[PDB]
């Protein structure tokens, strides 16, 4: 408990392309890099020579592969993949010293799913069976891991933004990865890691919306999405408020919509004109909340691959959503996040690796008194 040196720094990535862990599949073991995704629940790996893939699962080479004789077709808003379901032996080399028999979707066809240039070739869905495809009888990886071993039913993620890196501690927490205290919010329902946001402030100024708007139709914590995505009506109020707070510089409207980049002369980003963003989350106790605060260093994302420019260019990474709030890597890179599935709750603490400056830091503070927090959930 509390110290897992073998798992520290077991994540890698590049800006824009997410965080992956090494895994092995099959006998003898085939090494693959796998995107860590708390926003889905399938373990799905490229299993054919798509041109974007460094490596892919070759079932023919595994003596322990078992075919389930069942296909799956999985479309998302953008992107889709199709695969053939089976089971095989899976390990995490920089993870617990265990091997488990897990479901795997061998991806045989995909569109807009793999990233050209990335170094990962499958996804590890860490959420619950309820959103597994094709249905909840396909047990997710982490459920198999916990049923089949003595690994405790929890994992924690420290995502260190811009090469990016970080740690996924499987079966515990490592107290060297955060400072101050962990504060916990209840998992409202086990499907996504759904939570309830009870208040939102921009530089300490409350947006004063009906709090159900913050969770319409849900709010989730999702390592497989880059942005902080907010329900449209909340996005509108938040942007209006951020524009006001930064109004000593004027930016094109398209910037706030994520339709164009903004660039400054190198080493001169005016961090201090941009406000901090605070989300208050439902706490463990009746009428008690806590708040997490992030900086422009989290929500203004560096874009380095801008071949048509010399300067430091950034994308605004808070965007409008029609699927609820998504606390993607913009939120998670401020914090050490504990997915305490055994107690159905999510812990946040200030990350020991988060990007900040001499004036401001990411923060996790409580307790606050917040009434009617159960009305903030959408049914
Ligand atoms: N930081 C960062 C960062 C950068 C890139 C990325 C990245 O490419 N993710 C990725 C790629 C294809 C994918 F199909 C998905 C999916 C898989 F289920 C669907 C996606 C949705 F539902 F939104 F389509 O939401 C989530 N949660 N997972 C995620 N992830 C994180
Ligand atoms: Na167990
Ligand atoms: Na600590």
Curated annotation (Swiss-Prot):
What domain of life?
Eukaryota
The reaction(s) annotated as catalysed by this protein in its Swiss-Prot or TrEMBL entry are: Broad endopeptidase specificity. Cleaves Glu-Val-Asn-Leu-|-Asp-Ala-Glu-Phe in the Swedish variant of Alzheimer's amyloid precursor protein
Protein role:
Responsible for the proteolytic processing of the amyloid precursor protein (APP). Cleaves at the N-terminus of the A-beta peptide sequence, between residues 671 and 672 of APP, leads to the generation and extracellular release of beta-cleaved soluble APP, and a corresponding cell-associated C-terminal fragment which is later released by gamma-secretase. Cleaves CHL1.
Q: Name one GO cellular component term.
A: hippocampal mossy fiber to CA3 synapse
Subunit structure, as described in the record = Monomer. Interacts with RTN1; RTN2; RTN3 and RTN4; the interaction leads to inhibition of amyloid precursor protein processing. Interacts with SNX6. Interacts with PCSK9. Interacts with NAT8 and NAT8B. Interacts with BIN1. Interacts (via extracellular domain) with ADAM10 (via extracellular domain). Interacts with SORL1; this interaction may affect binding with APP and hence reduce APP cleavage. Interacts with NRDC AND NRG1.
Q: Which GO terms of the molecular function aspect are on file? A: amyloid-beta binding; aspartic-type endopeptidase activity; beta-aspartyl-peptidase activity; endopeptidase activity; enzyme binding; peptidase activity; protein serine/threonine kinase binding
> Which positions bear N6-acetyllysine?
70, 208, 212, 218, 232-233, 240
Record note on domains: DXXLL motif is required for a proper endocytosis and retrograde transport to the trans-Golgi network, as well as for regulation of lysosomal degradation. The transmembrane domain is necessary for its activity. It determines its late Golgi localization and access to its substrate, APP.
Tissue-specificity statement: Expressed at high levels in the brain and pancreas. In the brain, expression is highest in the substantia nigra, locus coruleus and medulla oblongata.
- Induction annotation: Up-regulated by the Ca(2+)-regulated transcription factor NFATC4.
User: Could you mention a single GO BP entry for this protein?
Assistant: amyloid-beta metabolic process
Family listed: Belongs to the peptidase A1 family.
Report the residue ranges that make up the Peptidase A1 domain in this protein: 19-349
Which keywords does the record carry? Acetylation, Aspartyl protease, Cell membrane, Cell projection, Cytoplasmic vesicle, Disulfide bond, Endoplasmic reticulum, Endosome, Glycoprotein, Golgi apparatus, Hydrolase, Isopeptide bond, Lipoprotein, Lysosome, Membrane, Palmitate, Phosphoprotein, Protease, Signal, Transmembrane, Transmembrane helix, Ubl conjugation, Zymogen
Q: How is its activity regulated?
A: Inhibited by RTN3 and RTN4.
> Where mainly located?
membrane
Q: List the active site.
A: 37, 222
- In this entry, the parts of the chain located on the Extracellular side of the membrane are 1-379
What the entry says about post-translational processing? Answer: N-Glycosylated. Addition of a bisecting N-acetylglucosamine by MGAT3 blocks lysosomal targeting, further degradation and is required for maintaining stability under stress conditions.
Sugar-modified residues: 97, 116, 287
**Localization annotation:** Cell membrane; Golgi apparatus, trans-Golgi network; Endoplasmic reticulum; Endosome
Q: State which Enzyme Commission number(s) the record gives.
A: 3.4.23.46
What name has this protein been given in UniProt? Beta-secretase 1
Which cysteine-cysteine pairs are annotated as disulfide bonds in the entry? 160-353, 211-376, 263-313
Whose protein is this, by species? Homo sapiens (Human)
